Design a protein around this nucleic acid. Structure first.
Lengths: 241, 241, 241, 241, 241, 241
RNA sequence: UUUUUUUUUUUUUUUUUUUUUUUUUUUUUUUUUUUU
């Protein structure tokens, strides 16, 4: 009956396992087919509407019918136009459905750049983040930044980017979710660490191209070492409450 | 399909984003509507009644029907006269509605000045605040002070004003809300930091005019550096329980 | 629309605000009404019955019908005689109504002196308070003592009297209220600090006359500095659980 | 109206207050009523049965019908004989009713002496108490010991006896009451301090006679100073968890 | 009425109290009844079946009908044969009833020796106990060990054996009782300290014979001083969580 | 009656006890039944499907119907075929039923080898484990590793492997179980230590064969001493929160 | 001298939240609690 030893003695095929992990992957976040659906509904005006949807998701939220209740007449007409065109939903729906958070996650490059302008209009302001860590990087102030993180970066550097980004996520998750307010750092960390690592390890946008974005935003140097601003934020998360 | 890199490589238009944030803005509070409604119901006697309502909201509270139960005959007639004229409500109602807290928040300048006289009649007395931080600024002893804070001030100075003001808010929020009494500093901070930052970043009263008020109250010097009293209160909040 | 600056630029009238704070004060002014009602129902025998009501409120409680259930035949007749004459009630009723706690609060001078005799008959004994702070002042062992506290006293000294008195209130509030037993020092403090400060800042009995009582009880010296017994009790409250 | 100063200036009559406190006293315990009922049901064999009831309450508990379920045939007949004769009950009944705890509390002198023999048969053994404080006084190992404590003893000495006695109460109350196990020393203190002080300040057995018992048990010397064993137990309670 | 002083002045009869404590003892003294019942039901094959019942109670538990559900066909027949012969029960039944835990408790000498062989088959393994205290005594790894403890041993030595044994009980009680998992060291201690002390102070097996067993197991030396392994485990309980 | 001493004086037969522990063992024989059922449903294609089920259980989870909801068309396909063939269930079912966790536990050899390829796809990534302990062993990244642990290894070495493996289990159990997030290290340890020790002490795969696997994975040397990576992870668990 | 638990637990690019929260010279509890 002890024939499992022979099954274990078998040489592991690296690519045979790589085929099944991509097949049995946690699908739902879409990312690559978000752009496929954006051009399907939007057509030619998909780029202008995507820019509108990034500002909308960053300042207000993910639920479009809830934010429409407390909004201006000018906003009410523009938001409803996007819901009836792109068939936008709220929460975590199917693979073929679109949400405001999914549009911001797929176009992570434009989203991170928009955070420099939209600094004091976010649920967690830049001044609040500056209090925890002096001169906190504005580009890290959204969960979609995890899609811009290069996993090929060295261990100490990769952890320094993720720990600095987790400082915002700790504050942000407690603001948007009221039942996580009383819960400790470790309890809050367990809710955002899983979708964060999934966005870093996603095959969408190559390792070299992702590294170029981090250099352009002024997060890492020519080699890959993070800036003093990132290092201070990563150290602040270690002693955070 | 990976054409999102080209969309991300695009230079972000600062003013194009500024147009949409004002369009998709959160329709809440608005200090302009309060003054517009005060002159609509009051007429000419709106300034004298506003002075009465600021003192009423400072010493008693926001609920007018609840405070009327335990009040003198002189007060009962004057308070009911304001409810039937200005159509005053309790809690968080619609944009077209008025509350005692909204009147005190819109006219933040007069409210701040009234705290110097009404020091020992507040829920949190000046002597109690003096125990935590020696010679605590009396002008910071109301959540409406956030509307007098200048966001154009340097980072270190802007945080010093907000941290000093948060020392009162920590004590005040635990007094008016009984379920926040047992909860830690971080838990209490999360409830008042959001409407505080919204009042600082609000377009009502220019950055230069707001800076003049802080100088007049004796909080900041000719340049913008806060006084020793403000600096001690900001340091006290860092080590607060 | 930004005309609130002109309303704020107005010079604050100290006495105009002083008129409205007394008008919009909590209830239709206490203490004075109690003595006015005591002479109205009692007549000439009001002083002897007040002495009886002080001993009754200090040893038993505020509810007269509840304490009558577990009392001697001699007590049952004397207590019922006071209820039918002075129309005594239980809890927090209207301005024109009388309670055993209100009689003890109005005549704070006689109440504090009675605590020296009635030391081991209180819910919190003198021996129990002497364990927390060596030689705890017996005169502070009732919430009515707040009416004998002089607010004109220097900041450091005024806080020393209130912190020493709060050490008793922390123990007393947890004894009379069972749901406050499990709650921390900060949670218990928030329930008694509000009516305590209201009795200190009350206009009943002059600042100079109140200072004379504290000197007579042996709490403060000829100038206003509290005794070693008061200073030790104030320090004990800072490290109290 | 400020004529309360004249009422307060009056010299407090020690004896006049002493008359009303005994008149308006709270009834719950019995002491005199217990012995009156023991001779009423027992008659001549009341002294032999009281000795049996002290051993029964000390080793087993207060509930007689519950302890009979897990007892020998010899015990079952003797215990039931006491229930049918003295009409013994369980819990906190009326003044005219008797319980095993009330018999042990009324005859505190015999109960404390029985603890020397019944040392390892108690819920909290003498060896367990020796671990907390070396050579712990055996006479203090029952809540009925509070009835033997002399309140006329000096402050430092009176607190030393109560703090040493509370060391047992802290362990015992957590053993019999399972919901008090998780609660801190201060939370446990609040449940036993009220009936403890009531027994100390009770008029049953004079101050001089109570002092003689403490001297006979070897707790205090010829003057009133407690022994090294009591002093060590009082110091152990101050640092107890 | 104060005639209790005369009743207390009476000389306490050591043996008169000793008669009633044995009469009013807790029905659990089955140490004699178990062996008496094993000889009645089993007969001559009682010694072989007792050895089987010790291994069964140590590895599985005290519920014979519950453990039979998840067991081999060979075990199912042997276990059911013991239940139908000795009339074995589960839980806490009457005096003249037998349970797997009662058989292991009565024959404590064989049970403790079986723990050396059955080390990794217990609910709490020997390797787990070695992590808390290096080289933890295997003979102490069962609540029945309390019946092998000599109470005539010196105070410091007696406490060292009990504190070392309590380290296992703390780990064991939390494994078998799931609601005790979240509860602190003090809460768990209160549940096992009472039946532990009862087994130590039990008259079954003389003080000298009990001391010989502890010497034979290698727990105490020729005089009575415990080994370095026992001393380390007693120190580990003091700093345990 | 005290004849238990003679029964205890008897020399314990090591193998006589070894016969009864295997007879009165928990369950039938798990791990053996899994392979027996895999060949029963699978037949010849059981080895290829087992490799697919290992990758599926490691990356997603134990519930097959829940993970199918958020998966690709290619993924939804291969998973549903395995449920209808092997009759796969979710949770803790009967002995004759199969789960994804049971397949991974029985074939522990290939499961440990799959973790060097699938490091960043696990709920707890390798980079996260590297932060707690530098260069954490990738073969210890699953609860099924306990089945590869050799119990015949020396005490200090055996504890070093289990303490290093417990570092992952502490992080993993808090990720998959949300109510264990707030609970301390000791509370989380009590839930995984019991099934861990059961897999180490299990008779499936001999002690010598298990030792060969740990040498092949690069965990222990030629004798049995663990590597510096394992020693650092075991030390990290001792100071872990 | 009781409690006898079980290779289990499989969570999720989302939980997107609001210038709000306005509490009270009040609260007046009782030699009890007796667990295995």
């Amino acid at each position: 009956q002890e024939l499992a030893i022979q099954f274990a003695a078998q040489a592991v095929d690296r690519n045979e396992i790589e085929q099944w992990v991509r097949e049995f992957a946690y699908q739902g976040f879409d990312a690559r087919r978000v752009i496929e659906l954006l051009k399907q509904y939007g057509g030619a005006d998909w780029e202008k509407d995507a820019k509108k949807m990034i500002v909308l998701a960053l300042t207000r939220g993910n639920k479009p019918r809830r934010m429409m209740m407390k909004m201006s007449k000018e906003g009410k007409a523009t938001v409803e136009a996007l819901i009836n065109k792109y068939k936008l939903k709220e929460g975590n729906p199917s693979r073929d459905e679109l949400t405001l958070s999914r549009v911001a996650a797929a176009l992570a490059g434009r989203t991170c750049q928009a955070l420099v302008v939209l600094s004091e209009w976010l649920p967690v302001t830049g001044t609040t983040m500056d209090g925890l860590s002096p001169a906190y990087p504005r580009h890290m102030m959204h969960p979609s930044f995890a899609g811009m993180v290069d996993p090929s970066l060295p261990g100490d550097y990769l952890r320094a980017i993720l720990d600095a980004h987790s400082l915002y996520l700790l504050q942000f998750s407690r603001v948007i979710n009221p039942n996580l307010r009383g819960r400790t750092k470790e309890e809050v960390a367990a809710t955002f660490t899983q979708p964060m690592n999934a966005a870093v390890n996603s095959n969408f946008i190559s390792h070299e191209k992702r590294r170029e974005f981090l250099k352009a935003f002024g997060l890492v140097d020519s080699n890959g070492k993070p800036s003093a601003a990132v290092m201070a934020a990563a150290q602040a998360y270690k002693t955070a409450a």
